[model samples]
Target chain A: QPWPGVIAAYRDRLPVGDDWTPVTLLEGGTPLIAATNLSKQTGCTIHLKVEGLNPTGSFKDRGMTMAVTDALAHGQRAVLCASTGNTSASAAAYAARAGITCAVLIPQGKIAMGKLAQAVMHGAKIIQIDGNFDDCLELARKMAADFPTISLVNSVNPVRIEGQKTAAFEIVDVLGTAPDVHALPVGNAGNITAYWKGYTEYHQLGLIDKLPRMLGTQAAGAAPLVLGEPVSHPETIATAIRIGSPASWTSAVEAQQQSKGRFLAASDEEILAAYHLVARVEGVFVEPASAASIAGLLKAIDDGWVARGSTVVCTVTGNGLKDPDTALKDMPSVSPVPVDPVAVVEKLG
Target chain B: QPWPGVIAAYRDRLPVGDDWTPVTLLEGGTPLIAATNLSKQTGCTIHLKVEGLNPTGSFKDRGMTMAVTDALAHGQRAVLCASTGNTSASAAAYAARAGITCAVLIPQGKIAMGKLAQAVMHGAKIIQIDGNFDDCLELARKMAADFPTISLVNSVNPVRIEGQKTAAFEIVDVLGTAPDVHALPVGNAGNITAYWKGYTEYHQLGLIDKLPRMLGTQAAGAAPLVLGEPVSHPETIATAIRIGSPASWTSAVEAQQQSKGRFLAASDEEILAAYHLVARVEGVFVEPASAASIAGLLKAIDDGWVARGSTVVCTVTGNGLKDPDTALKDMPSVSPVPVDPVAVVEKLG
Candidate 1:
């Protein structure tokens, strides 16, 4: 009954060798919570693939496990990433678990230091580059190319995609068949591509009879895929999906086209609205970016694109605890009550 | 294959009736990650029952699920608690799921607004009582007694203990038997008592051959159990366990004596050290209060109280992300590097 992490649990399906020791933190096996309230609102059956419950409080851990394990197998001494968000935390934790160094490159003066607290606690070496995220990625790529002992565990890595695909597999395993539609927030676009790959692989293996139509949602300010052009500066309240240029642009587009899907964008207001709705109505607190999926679904319903009573799954990618500032921005005022039961009752009433 | 939260997962073992609806957020079934580094360091087989992975990022969700379910069963319109920490967040979330009002009473000016963000997001009504924690708790008790429609879900609730005991059942189920020792941080002391009850019940029912010795740890500043007296003013860096008087004092003492266990105290410095060590070495970022168990284990090893090669499980009660400020206080300095691959490499070296 003890879950031996994702690697041991899905060894036969994963790209793991007999001698490769897994660098795992028991990721995967997250809850596929039935969104009954959401279903009532959308006129469809909805299940939330809550990846935020993962070890690092994000879906990034799914990919990090495979990337770090592959790096360990190749005798790499360090793993590197160009991230100031969930990716850096996941990489640092898996690297620490593997007894290897993790170096994360971030743009100078661009991050709230508190956001990197998890990475710091996991002993990640942070190097601030005097440039933007794109420049940091360029330098990270060059470093991985030049250093034989350093491995890049970014979303571009094939093993990272391989690991992320497991989320799709888990969904099918739970539902006993693919949902009618699967929706997820798109940032670098690696996740949509990975889910598509997982669905097709399961269908080929006869593990699933059908595959779902992929629905990718991006922030309106960062709608590179939807607009078919990169924005010079993406601005969005959803920091996780505030990507101007997507790394897996081609694959993400192909997944949408092949799965008879379309990419959509949600305004920041819509995202925040959905975020609070999920938390208040469904008791599910997710990061702002994750709300884009729900926002897109609601928009699609209004546009008559989504059929009534369809089975839909929206992936809430990260925990809401990751960003408390936005959540508290519109917090209701707390009224003071005297230390008396009568006063407490009156206040509550 | 889909996990139906703890209520459905352990239906037969729980005090829940078949007709009652479960107010759940898929709490429990958290991973018991092996602490390989700590195991080697202490010469014991150490596994961490990572309770931080719960819905509200704390073990309180386990009890909240049952408490809220019972409240719903009893036709309660709202649930009340006197908590400014994990319990408030959990109670708020489960109450939201159950479609009921959750009112949390806390001492005025004592809590950081950011700490209550989760509760706020979950649509809880926060009432600041113009008194101390004890007074607020007293008010909460009186209000619950006066209002037949309001249910109090504090530690004094017997069903909460029944719900929390499932953690012990999970440990035995996973390990195939009881461990040699089960260590956990003691705040209000209800958890240790609940776990002891669970272990004894399972042993009596022939589910396990033996029971574990309960090792309860408290912060030195709030060592009411260790001091054999209630502290008038408890102080600790571990905010979750900073209680002057534990509610389940008698039950906690009885559990310790019956299990042939002992209560120990760890200084704030030692608790913080263990907190950082667990994150850096074992890749488990737990709350400062949760690290008290690890601190006590290390201290017990030095005192020759723990035997070598013992199977030990430390219950990490909450996630480190819950208190990012503490984790960031001593964050390593980030040095800026030129936007050049060569310079980045040199700086990293």
Candidate 2:
């Protein structure tokens, strides 16, 4: 309720364009929603930092906007990124705003329809390669080398991490202290690194007094960070993070080691189970990857890694919109009745 | 460039929210872009207020957010709306943010895939009515009366019109004065009424010196305002504005009369042509409906309504991402070459 001061604090400090500061879309300031409904299921005070509240309907937007802004500031003509869904759409949309070309390379047939639709609408030059995400990453890496002029606007770029650091800043601002544990899904493992960097920076800046134990979750089929090795055949309904070789696997592990935390993997069944739980219990419809965080949070609580009554924040990144097909599958279809005014009124009653 | 400190002046006031202001997403602060390209083509200096920048990638987010906020503030449990596409997506998304149940009736088989994707994503209880948008509207209207407990959050609701008027405020803020002409594409025609209300309110408030010549454009197939009658078989590639009967048709005409402007129609080809030009020249890619303003601007210019050098702002109401299939029609398929680093570098050169 007393957020005008917070707005003032962030005023003139937020990102701005020539004519606009882009309304922040108020992205990172998601609710530290107490999952009262999930308390029975998890036996812990489950709190979710609903990062899907970001403008582009994903946390990637928070980082991507900052990265793209920096890219524009540096006078980059175009941007290139490797993505599953969220990154590509964000990159494409932002690049369109800056009037620059955005080229995204994705694994063949993996990117969600919603994501692809956004990219297509934003006029992003989509390159669908007949390979897995790792192969796409390899090609993108080579392309970045070949075209130095083009800004590689992926998580590999440091600015993306810098932008993502805001999540930690926001969490500390709202909670007034770092939670006992911070949990989030690890894709290319970039967000974990960024979050750790943010917490350390906040502590160094006297913004926060304590650091939360960083808990990173990856899909069982694609957890390069947890296993310290690449998966030969990664598979998951969580298409966004079904990455075999995470580019920042070491960075993520470093974050874990430095923060005295751990990296864990969630099975497809667990991820999906958590996915539905988040929707029904938390009222947050997130994709499978975003479910990784909740799954991990519950796993830690169950494993006694998370202490009872200790405050914990689990970040749910992408919106269920990006992966609607997954959410819509189990939904009960409401058959429409014919247009009778009396019947409509009766139905409403 | 040395205009009033509008951004700084209003930086203190933001849409009421603890997490993020509605303004943070750059939803209302649209660009009052001078259409020099359109001017050169049609001998009128056309300006465009680009609202495609809204959070959900449509102008409707502006109204929907405000409406949803009001609905929540007033203790409404469920908000109902009938949307062809943009309104549904925007309303659905904002409703999710507000944690309210949103019910929508969309004309079956008429809505685009992308809009439907957003609608479902936002957790809206979607019902595909086996009728036109008009029938859906009638059903929604009857439901609103029958169920006083349910808040109808459609454009017919006055609060939506009130929220949409902010676009006019933004235009005056940027331009320093009312334009010689103001134009928008008409569907439900709520936006036109909103703009006119904004302009008149500003004029009465001594914010602006004079009223702009308000122009309304409808897709030729759906030219209700121009024909002085409701269309029965409206059709166009610009699916967002393909409406036969508009709710605010009389009000749109009132806006035209009050501003001494006229209502006009543009063919589908003309709208598509403007859409292409906006992409190639101004570098603002918009959907076919958004392009109607540009099309109408050009037509009015050639018809001697918009005089040369007259300042005009055409409302580009929705983002191009809403309808991407239109742009892909004429796109050239670039054959992929082998993974040659040198070739990639050379190609950029």
Candidate 3:
């Protein structure tokens, strides 16, 4: 009755065959924890849609579950994706779930191998392309196009979007209505597009009477959506969102314009600060890119874009454990103390 | 309806004040994923209680939520624990949620700072003791006894045990009955004791007509439970279970004997193999210690203690992300490849 994978729980809503089986890791049914500290600071009722707790430690698992399920159902021999981190991890996990080979294309010499640890652990064939991410993505698309047995599971996959929209449905179901504002970090722009699509569908179904205004945040170094044009070279400490040319750029624009939403940019410094704040204040340790949502919320509160006492849900897209390097980079070392109560308690007060 | 944290969702069963305001991070509604390959290989209906999906990426969150909530409700100013890794991380996160100071005591020169990243991120005061782990734990107990304002949460907290029992309740709720056998890694032994207590309670309350045989596994290097004695220096790759003296030894023994259960030791090699197997086979990436359960299950299957076609639930207690160093230590380096579809396709076949 609870914690079934997205496909099983939303079979009626999803476009899957009645006889089709789900390739699931129980990916959806994430937590919507109240961010009391964030609410107190911003004068808004803020909740964190903790997508980090998903099976693969990222929101990508939500879509990946669907993509891989669809791929397996279509008798695909393998699933392929070009990813810097989270996507490869999720895709590999679900592909493993379906008992199939997973292929990951990475831009050569550009990513920390540590980020792909999950993908590697899941037995994904890691192919380092002698090109950048865009080229790798294009090559994957081409490979899928050329082959009948390999499925391209990038955001361009329609079913993946259908899968991602479940997050909105979950939010609406829990809150009993849509939140006044929904904020999240924008990576390849697919998530924002997916969320917008999900919320609109819910509205049309009358599952929710009102739709929330979407607020998308991107790292300044990779703010193509904010810039209204793509930058060939993207840079950011929030590596997950370090994308210049997002695949769902046009659909993202539609979501932004249709929902009367906004796209904003946050510097790496702001991302780090918000990341630290969520852990220290709300006890939610999230990856640096996921903090961009919190960063945007703080900026929106200051600029009065978010009204006082407005119900807001910030989607933190991935777990902090995904990248411990960022978390421990600035961790202060503690000196050893004698085995006395006074010695340890002295530092507390 | 799901993931309201352990305390909130299981309030009726948990012992808390009538008007107790719970401090939570939505800790416990993890997936009970079917390990298809493990099941296929063992000829049993094997499932994994994926505790890695908990808020803190460990099952410690279940107890931490209760301990911190109790500490706050009792008007305690701080919560204290002596832990190597998972306990410190969970205590700090829950303490942060309770808006109280958290003090973590660890032995000097004895841990990876990466393991404490979550504790540091949650603003816990990390104090290194000049003595070993046992000394640090004893000192913590003394400090808590001396200072009424500081509550000790290191398995000694009764409410934590009470909260941890909810895992069993959840398993029963979902499976509609107790499993034929429940297997998990044994460390401080509280988890096994809690699960035993939960299953027994369900049986006594007539909610479950049967109780599971508790199979507790410990690392070979840290096999005090198997040896029926205390170890002076516990050592294993499964650091989480590397405890010389378990706190709930009597209760662990009680559960083992009463349910006709067994305690076994898994070698580090077996742990690592099981760890890799779970990730590669079931897409469930857990810390090395968590895989001791899988190692135990395999041993149980081979030893004829577990029957064919038996329903088994192995609790993987922590996420693999919690220890990335181990995951990446021997990851094969992927060489760069040409961005040609045929070139990439050659490797797959």
Candidate 4:
């Protein structure tokens, strides 16, 4: 028996008709790798729920699998979304798998081509909007509204949350209980809301006795949740979370309130540092935005918000392969050497 | 519980001491996804053993975990390898995880930066050799031989084959029986031999009653097995399979002979076609070399060598994200649109 896709694996918990066949590429069931070095450094039992291992190299695959499956069940002809990068790649893959077209609306600038490679390889219809992230998102929503046959899957879709919440269930299933604290990078804020929903549901079902505090970390330039108001212009090296306005604002706030959680902003420098640290020390190469969780975890530890001996799970949302440009930006210079063993040994030192 | 990495998962079967703790990135238990559209097209019950989902975005992680674990258990101070891309990235990550150093000797040119991106991020010492791949391999072998504490973890390492054989076990464990045919891209030929060894061991243990016919696909320019002689220069878009002299030639031939299997060559055109087909149709984005298996499967089907309704498993070995340059080589051009819902709706069609 092959590992069934998320919809089948968690069918009992998911809200779907018995006949709703999932349009799946076997997404979900990502790695929950123990962060040994980080644990040693922080004095906490730490794990990284590596969502980058998902089908499209991002956690967006979790939501897109559900969204596209619902679209097919509902007789949708196409799927639509506005994405910085990850969501577009996920939508493109799932929509193609479902034998339907997908159109992605991307903001004009700063998007990584590595992410676009996936969408293009899957034959997605991509349109650049000569505006910002929020502007592209609004247009996509209104466009989907006008077209009855085009389903919007931009994390705003309720079923996407229904699908993404499974990640938390998996953590509990593996660890036998929820972590004391769960951390993740917040982009449109939908994932934090989804994870909180997942943890709470498991607690209510008596699968876990306690709810984990949700720590949502955003890029400093896009820290609308931290600042208490949306910014007209947001910028960050972590392009995935570079949003002035988060789509799931109210729900995200509610998760923080209900879980006794907190939100913080990670500067680009901090995010980059954690990005390199996670890869260099823990051997987990994740995208810059995904490092926001690690950045937040370090911050929480330093401030005594999270204590020693606590168990934590940090969700690294996307694969580092999603942005090759950044990885190679500071790559040590390489020069050719003669094919001699002694010469190579000399270079090694 | 979380998936114990390969060595720990199959500890009883593997050659390791009970007291030896494995250094792992949780690299195995990859998805065996049903290839719906490919099955429809080829008229075979097709499944894809997606090794691309491994920790380092390649099946190389399977071998590296075992190699590095063995390295640590032996008090090795460093690991060494000569890789085109995937192997280097895998060794670097595992070595870093084990708190040891690693060095990769790569040929002078024509490698994907996306692959090197991983090795560099994991703090591997990379050296470009002013010679061909075979030259680099010789130098690495000699260097490791001279150094008492440096372990060579290339495909030739016996433990790597021991590690890679686990993939076959996983396939059998999932499917309850071996497929009639198992297909994969042949680079250094280590995996083919490993899979054969695994199936034979399982049959001997009565875990599986049958052995699959191995179908090794090589890029036409690099078809050393098909030609029965090594080529001086091999050229293909599938860089992973662009090896002229395979390290495991004898065992690979043994596997082919014993299983009544044959090797085949797929041209660059055919590989690229299948590369696009798998992504655009089945929604599984794999690297160009990984598509060699698909191309070979299609060829086998076209000639009626593989009958309709036969069960087949094609191991797509590496993630497409490992080569963003190839994915975007023929990307469709994009033009900016006005921020109007109606215009977006018009563009969707």
Which candidate's DockQ is highest?
Answer: 1
Q: Write candidate 2's Cα lDDT for B151-259 as tens digits.
A: 8887677878877877888778767888889988888889999889888988988988879998888889988888888888888888877888887877887888889
Off by over 4 Å in 3: A337-339, B109-111
TM-scores for chain B, listed for all candidates: 0.96, 0.86, 0.96, 0.94
Q: List the residue pairs that clash in candidate 2.
A: A23-B24, A24-B24, A25-B24, A25-B25, B35-B46
Q: Compose the digit string of candidate 3's lDDT tens values, residues B1-349.
A: 6567688888888888977799989888789988889998899998899999999899989999998988899999888878757888899998998899998888878666777788989998889888976798789889999999999888857888998999998899888999999999999899999999999989989998778999999999999999999998899988889988998988999999999999999899998899989999999888998999899889989999998999998999999988887888778888888778899886886
Cα lDDT, model 1, residue B212: 89
lDDT of candidate 4 over B1-349, digit per residue (tens): 4677898888888888766779899898988888988998889999999888999999988889889988999888888877747888899899889988888888887654556778879988888888987788788788788987889987878899999999999999999999999999998899999999999999999988778999999999999999999988899999888888998989999999999887999998999999999999989899988999899889998988897899999999999988787897877878788887777665656
- Work out the TM-score per prediction: 0.98, 0.76, 0.97, 0.96
Residues forming the 10-long window of minimal summed lDDT in candidate 1 chain A: A340-349
Candidate 2 vs 4: which has more DockQ = 4
Candidate 1 lDDT by residue in tens digits, B16-59: 88899887888888888889999999999999999999999999
lDDT of 2 by residue, A1-349 (tens): 1121112234344444454333122334554566666776666666777665454557886777776676677667778877647787777756765667777665655444445655555567766566676677777778776665678877767767777877787788777888889999988888889889989988888988789999989888888878877888888888878888777877887898989999898898898788866664444657678998889888888899888888888888876655655754555556656777665544433
Would you list the clashing residue pairs of candidate 3?
none
In model 1, the clashing pairs are none
Ranking by DockQ: 1, 3, 4, 2
